[PDB]
Design a protein around this ligand. Structure first.
Ligand SMILES: O=C(O)c1ccc2cc1OCCOCCNc1ccn3ncc-2c3n1
Length: 337
């Protein structure tokens, strides 16, 4: 019955009038509303499916946000502000401040073109700062991806560009906020075996080795690559293929992780069980290639970004760079006076 309560013109809680849908998901949807009790200002309302797994996640999200918005009332660390929550026809609804497009939707609407490097540098710094704040408060997000990173303002200028014979959108302000804390997990809570959206999922997660803050760093690495290229480098829906893609881009998995995993089905004699001359094998070869071959320039600033990404995509989570270290990386030197 969600379709029946989330339409343009419906009024929620005698207050919020739905204008349009901002996004949809397995969880339910996010709608833009007019808040008639706050003078007509626009807000985002997340309407959660009335299904146990999503109700529990929504309840968990509300606890996490109460904590974060109380610790950082000014959003210095750029987590979205929750304004309130309520029930509407048995559905949990969470009201948030209204932001601009997700970084994913902006890329999508721009024909899957990447962001400019100077924007990426600022967005990356802000993502690392925001998530590091979570890591400093004993939390792991677990579901970082471009859909969950939103521009504060997604306005852009638009010009014909000769170089690419097409109209192109240039983002005006690249400031972001991090959203979606429904999967966020405290150090002392139960760690679900499966986390992250596949394309952003860390190798310790796929291998069911246990996970913790470093899995977020992996996700951020995947995000930065997508921002740079305009597409994901792990476009797959299959775990084994995904691991094969990693292997082509980053080299072989560490032995000790292969030996430790309970997912035997991927391996044979401690090597990935993957015929590189199969149909899917030839695809993985011709489409994927070593990480640095994706660089669009040899200019040092590009090299600095790729050095950071490479450190974020370290297989062994115990060795993977932390966000505290990442914030001091040379890629960010240009942001400092
Ligand atoms: O899960 C939350 O905590 C969440 C909170 C707020 C918003 C979205 C959220 O969900 C995931 C993102 O979905 C992208 C859809 N597009 C837009 C566009 C503009 N806004 N402004 C706030 C949100 C929003 N979503």
């Amino acid at each position: 019955s969600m379709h029946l309560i989330c339409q343009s013109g419906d009024v929620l809680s005698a207050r919020y009038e739905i204008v349009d849908t901002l996004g949809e998901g397995a969880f339910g949807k996010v709608v833009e509303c007019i808040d008639h009790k706050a003078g007509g200002r626009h807000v985002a309302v997340k309407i959660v499916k009335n299904v146990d797994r999503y109700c529990e996640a929504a309840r968990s999200e509300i606890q996490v946000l109460e904590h974060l918005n109380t610790t950082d009332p000014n959003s210095t660390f750029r987590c979205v502000q929750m304004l309130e929550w309520f029930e509407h026809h048995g559905h949990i609804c969470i009201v948030f401040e209204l932001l601009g497009l997700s970084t994913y939707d902006f890329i999508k609407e721009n024909g899957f073109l990447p962001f400019r490097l100077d924007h990426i540098r600022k967005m990356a710094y802000q993502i690392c700062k925001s998530v590091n704040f979570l890591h400093s408060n004993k939390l792991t997000h677990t579901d970082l991806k471009p859909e969950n990173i939103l521009f504060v303002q997604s306005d852009y200028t638009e010009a014909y560009n000769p170089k690419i014979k097409r109209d192109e959108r240039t983002l005006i302000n690249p400031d972001i906020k991090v959203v979606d804390f429904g999967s966020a997990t405290y150090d002392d809570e139960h760690h679900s075996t499966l986390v992250s959206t596949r394309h952003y999922r860390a190798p310790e997660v796929i291998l069911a080795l246990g996970w913790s803050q470093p899995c977020d760093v992996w996700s951020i690495g995947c995000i930065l690559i997508e921002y740079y290229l305009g597409f994901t480098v792990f476009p797959t829906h299959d775990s084994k293929e995904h691991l094969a893609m990693m292997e082509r881009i980053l080299g072989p998995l560490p032995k000790h992780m292969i030996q430790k995993t309970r997912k035997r089905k991927y391996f044979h004699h401690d090597r990935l069980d993957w015929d590189e001359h199969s149909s899917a094998g030839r695809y993985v070869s011709r489409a994927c290639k070593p990480l640095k071959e994706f660089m669009l320039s040899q200019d040092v600033e590009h090299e600095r970004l790729f050095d950071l990404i490479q450190k974020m995509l370290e297989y062994d989570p115990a060795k993977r760079i932390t966000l505290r270290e990442a914030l001091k990386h040379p890629f960010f030197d240009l942001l400092k006076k």
